[PDB]
Amino acid sequence: MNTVPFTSAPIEVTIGIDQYSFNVKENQPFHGIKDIPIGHVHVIHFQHADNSSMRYGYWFDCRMGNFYIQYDPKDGLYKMMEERDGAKFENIVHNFKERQMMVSYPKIDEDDTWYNLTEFVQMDKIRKIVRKDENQFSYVDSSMTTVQENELSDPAHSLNYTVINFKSREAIRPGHEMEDFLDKSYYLNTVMLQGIFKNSSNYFGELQFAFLNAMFFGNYGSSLQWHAMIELICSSATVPKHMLDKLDEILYYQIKTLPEQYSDILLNERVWNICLYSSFQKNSLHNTEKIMENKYPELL
Amino acid sequence: GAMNSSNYAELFNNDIKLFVDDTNVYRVTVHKTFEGNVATKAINGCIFTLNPKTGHLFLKIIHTSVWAGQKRLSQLAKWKTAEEVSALVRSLPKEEQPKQIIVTRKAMLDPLEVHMLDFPNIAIRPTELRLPFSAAMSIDKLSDVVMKATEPQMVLFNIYDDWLDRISSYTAFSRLTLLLRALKTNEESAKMILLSDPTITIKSYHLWPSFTDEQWITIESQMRDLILTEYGRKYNV
Structure with missing residues (x-):
């Protein structure tokens, strides 16, 4: 201690x-x-x-x-x-x-x-x-602003989160435009997991750190990063089973810990509704969906 | 951003731009099956890609074979449109490539943006105008070449015939949209107006009849009357 x-x-x-x-x-x-x-x-x-x-x-x-x-x-x-x-x-x-x-x-x-x-x-x-x-x-x-926010201004004071952009050449293989845009598995598994993060643990680590910075400092770019990393998993049709199960646990504790009065600003309606109800993984986040429905049904 | 009544003259400046309309890309007839279920049969379609300044029309004919064995065709049709528009732009010399592409339906924005990633300087724009380009298949010569196609094919037209020799682009576009709006609201009547006088013909190399300036005023007035009538009917006013 x-x-x-x-x-x-x-x-x-x-x-x-x-x-x-x-x-x-x-x-x-x-x-x-x-x-x-x-x-x-x-x-x-x-x-x-x-x-x-x-x-x-x-x-x-x-x-x-x-x-x-x-x-x-x-x-x-x-x-x-x-x-x-x-x-x-x-x-x-x-x-x-x-x-x-x-x-x-x-x-x-x-x-x-x-x-x-x-x-x-x-x-x-x-x-x-x-x-x-x-x-x-x-x-x-x-x-503090993120590298991605800066691209769209002091670099020494930036949050160098991994840039995720669903309409970018990194995310979309020439010739697989529709396929890669509607099923982000290539971008998740090859580009991000195999390529940049190397393993799911480092991906979850950055996701968890982005959430914590959003919650504890109201850091808006961190909130953007957290939602992007969730959306990239949920919008992939092919995700390792161990990742989905761990994601459900991660998000469950994040939603559990969030101040009840801050759901208005720290939670992106589009992402959550898409992830829980429309996405490929709509049925893979039982714990997270249950706590969201009982705690923030207004958002949904 | 979006193209609307306020920035309407931008269409006729000297920055190359194209309208893209995907309405007629995926076309079906709905029918009953022997068992009494419903099924669709596709027919040939087309992408309507139009330079509003010059009248150059890039009519990419979409042959029914492109749908064979495919699912979620109405969604595929947006991406196929985006693929073909991107291929068209790539086929053009650099100095002919558009600086903007305006999609007539907002659902084309993401498909076209993703297909045009290689062209970051080409702006993809929606519009708030309710443009009548769906009625393109009411132009007999365009309908004929689409239906007769036996394979994918691009056919090049000038949708203004020779009008630009006598009028400006703004006025030519206004005539085109009035003609198409009329054909969309009441095709039979619109086509009756255009052909009622057998002495006015359509040149082999044209789409519309060879009206004198004075006859175009009469024609245009007849088209506006058609559109207002229909409107009171539609709405009882």
């Missing part, structure tokens, strides 16, 4: 750690988060009380280093940093734990939600989507 200490909390802020969140008051004696489960990626995220605009946060994996948060009064945000002096860090953490100035990662033992949301998400892949190689953790916020 690992710890992310906070130097201080000088401004009032709502702090998220994965699917949990705490309100911290201005200059409240908050000094971090302990008992963070080892084995998963995690995200710590922030929304300032005075500007409910720009949610922002850091993806990290405590196995890769000792990380802490420190407010920067010049750039006006909570920044993640790495402490390279291992003894200096253990001493900071132990003092803060002794003074009980840390919240405990509040995981119920029965609860597999975070595992189920991050099953295929790997820090090394995050770091290729979010390019900043001098850090071991990755900053994401509400406003």
